[PDB]
Amino acid sequence: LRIIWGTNVSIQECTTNFRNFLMSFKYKFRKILDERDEELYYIKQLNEMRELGTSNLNLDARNLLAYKQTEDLYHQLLNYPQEVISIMDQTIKDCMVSLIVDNNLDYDLDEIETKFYKVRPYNVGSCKGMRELNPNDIDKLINLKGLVLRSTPVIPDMKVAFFKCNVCDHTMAVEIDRGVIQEPARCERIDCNEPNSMSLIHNRCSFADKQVIKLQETPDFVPDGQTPHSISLCVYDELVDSCRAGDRIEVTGTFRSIPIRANSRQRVLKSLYKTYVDVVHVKKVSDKRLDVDTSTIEQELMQNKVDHNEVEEVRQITDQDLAKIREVAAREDLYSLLARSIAPSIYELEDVKKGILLQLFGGTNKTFTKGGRYRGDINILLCGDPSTSKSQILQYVHKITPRGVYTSGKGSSAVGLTAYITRDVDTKQLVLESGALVLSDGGVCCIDEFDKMSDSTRSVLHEVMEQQTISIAKAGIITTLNARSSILASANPIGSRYNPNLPVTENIDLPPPLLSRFDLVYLVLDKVDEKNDRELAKHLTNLYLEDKPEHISQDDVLPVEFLTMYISYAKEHIHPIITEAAKTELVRAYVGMRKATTRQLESMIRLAEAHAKMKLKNVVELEDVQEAVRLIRSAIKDYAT
């Protein structure tokens, strides 16, 4: 028997069971979890990784839940994660060199013995936010889901306590002991004995890296009377410059406690321990929504490369699904099936939904040698009767888009949109907070009730609709930043119940230029008649007929996943350069439609090039201009007046 004090954790038995589970795991969870070819799920990781020289690895919880001999390991890595991982980092090197025994190799063995190893349990048992952590369950592997507000700078920490003796041309050295230093006062008695003569230098010593992150908590359930909390934590080195503002996150870590000082003056402390979280792994992406522009973030990619930390930045693909995509694109009912699939719970709204999807393609992101940039974003407006799915559409897009914020009515101001400055409650120092405009930099910026908004708040969007650049000049802060988000929002009519026979470029309670510069608008008038109403009636009732609408899957609808991944590969790998035929159909379209300004030109091109991105063309074509100008005149309903 071997065992730890206050503990039921064996080292070598854990190593053996680890190794046996490791040699034995072959998509077991497909079998035991569910009904769902391959072989030895895990082992391929450990065969591949060696030649690339990396000291990391990821790991599920379920594969322990699936394999026989790992059910007790689950509750033990759970309770003693840093201890169980101080084991497994050794068991892993053990399994490594127990697996190399069956191989003869060029002399790479100068390194692996000098190497370290570490693990990252990510997809784990769910936890309900923060309130659950009454003190019974502190210091345990934990999972969470939320987004980012504020990032600190780097905390260093003594990691090698260098020490300069004053005499005898001698240095000295000593390391950290559960997080302290006990300076050796003496002077190395043999050579010289001066029992408190020694000095300290920083430039010698070894420093750690630590960072702290403010986070907003976004549960799935809340109690009666709930509201946000803002939590701090600690990440450590090799994870730096990963998670920042503008990201939703699923995460893991360990909940813990700590006291603080009463002052900078003495050691008298608080009865109540400030809580926090130490970090184990972060999940930057997920399945139910697409990901960042791959062009936007290049410097961060090459940085993570240089740093040899490779926690994900972009979802990865399979070739069989690439072929699946080239198959699904061969058919011609794309242009409608995308539409029918965006919103099965809703009636037709064809052009509306198509425009939503074309903005989700976005468009073109070109730059100039030094003095140009033209971004893939087309600002969108809606208008018409209430009592439709305008608001529903908008909630839907705000969910499904990764990087975006929602605004409503007149409860907003320029201060809470561009930069604002504030103070921390712990450090009591002057630290900033990013603005809801810039948070969506790349993605969605959603609004409702655009009309009643203050003219102070409505004044800023003059420039954001052009350059994706806000500027600030206020206290101790001067910097023109970038806000590549797109705009997508509702308007409400002049008065109530409409005025069919009037220039609707005047019938809004909104002036011309603000409205003309929108790349496109959509219209929601009623036109009451059956053949559009009864059908919608059953369309929305049969939703309620079921506990949840799965039998809405009829009438040819896709799933979200193949869709979204097709979209992501599309967004990330094609560049349609503009063609010559489309010129002569675009120019005449614009000019003849002028009978109301030059921005709808930019609208047509930025949307037709997205039409080109769709179908997976690496080229635009004359035909895209056709549906472009067509659906434009269908949008504002050219025929009536």
Binding site: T227, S387, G411, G416, E449, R497, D533, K538
Partner: protein
């Protein structure tokens, strides 16, 4: 952060009075709430999209105190229907004399002011403890809608739509019935089923729904 009057409420009730006297800001917020159960803010530290899950009940008066029978409710009333489309229900509670009804009105008023005890009917209305008890138990179900009622509902919708549009663009005409009207008919029919405590819907309920709906404005015509 602690919230205003609303956010203390969630999965519960509010009440408002003299809505017409409130600011355009309260309108901007409640125009969000009645349809979508969120609140959006972009002022300072608070940048939330906060959950309300609340149930609005306002009140106000028209512009002239007493009604203008020679004007419409769509002119006599102060609020826009750009918002009021969200108002699934709307009563118009005005008063005209009658020699007989106000007699026993005063009987009622006088007996209650005589002693707080309500009229001595052969009846016992009951404590709210027991009432919240029954509400909570009826809040436990989640009934179903058949097709036999769905079709009839569809027909009544189309009836009211075409009728109110082509006919009621006139004196006593408020706007036009909506999808939200239908959605509310549906919700309230569900609630009727929840009250009878069966997991399905009978055709015997939609009649009460639309009855009460067109009953809400009967006194507009006297």
């Amino acid at each position: 952060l602690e919230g205003g009057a609303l956010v203390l409420a969630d999965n519960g009730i509010c009440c408002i009075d003299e809505f017409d006297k409130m600011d355009e800001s309260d309108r901007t917020a409640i125009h969000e709430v009645m349809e979508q159960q969120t609140i959006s803010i972009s002022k300072a530290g608070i940048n939330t999209t906060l959950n309300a899950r609340t149930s609005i009940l306002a009140a106000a008066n028209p512009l002239y105190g007493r009604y203008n029978p020679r004007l419409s409710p769509l002119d006599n009333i102060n609020l826009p229907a750009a918002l009021l489309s969200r108002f699934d229900i709307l009563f118009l509670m005005l008063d005209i004399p009658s020699r007989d009804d106000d007699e026993k009105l005063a009987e009622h008023v006088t007996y209650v002011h005589m002693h707080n005890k309500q009229p001595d009917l052969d009846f016992t209305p009951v404590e709210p403890s027991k009432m919240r008890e029954y509400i909570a138990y009826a809040k436990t179900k989640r009934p179903v809608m058949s097709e036999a009622v769905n079709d009839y509902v569809v027909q009544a919708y189309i009836r009211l739509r075409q009728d109110s549009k082509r006919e009621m663009d006139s004196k006593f005409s408020f706007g036009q019935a909506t999808p939200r009207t239908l959605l509310g008919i549906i919700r309230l029919s569900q609630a009727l089923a929840k009250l009878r405590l069966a997991d399905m819907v009978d055709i015997d309920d939609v009649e009460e729904a639309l009855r009460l709906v067109r009953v809400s404005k009967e006194s507009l015509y006297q």
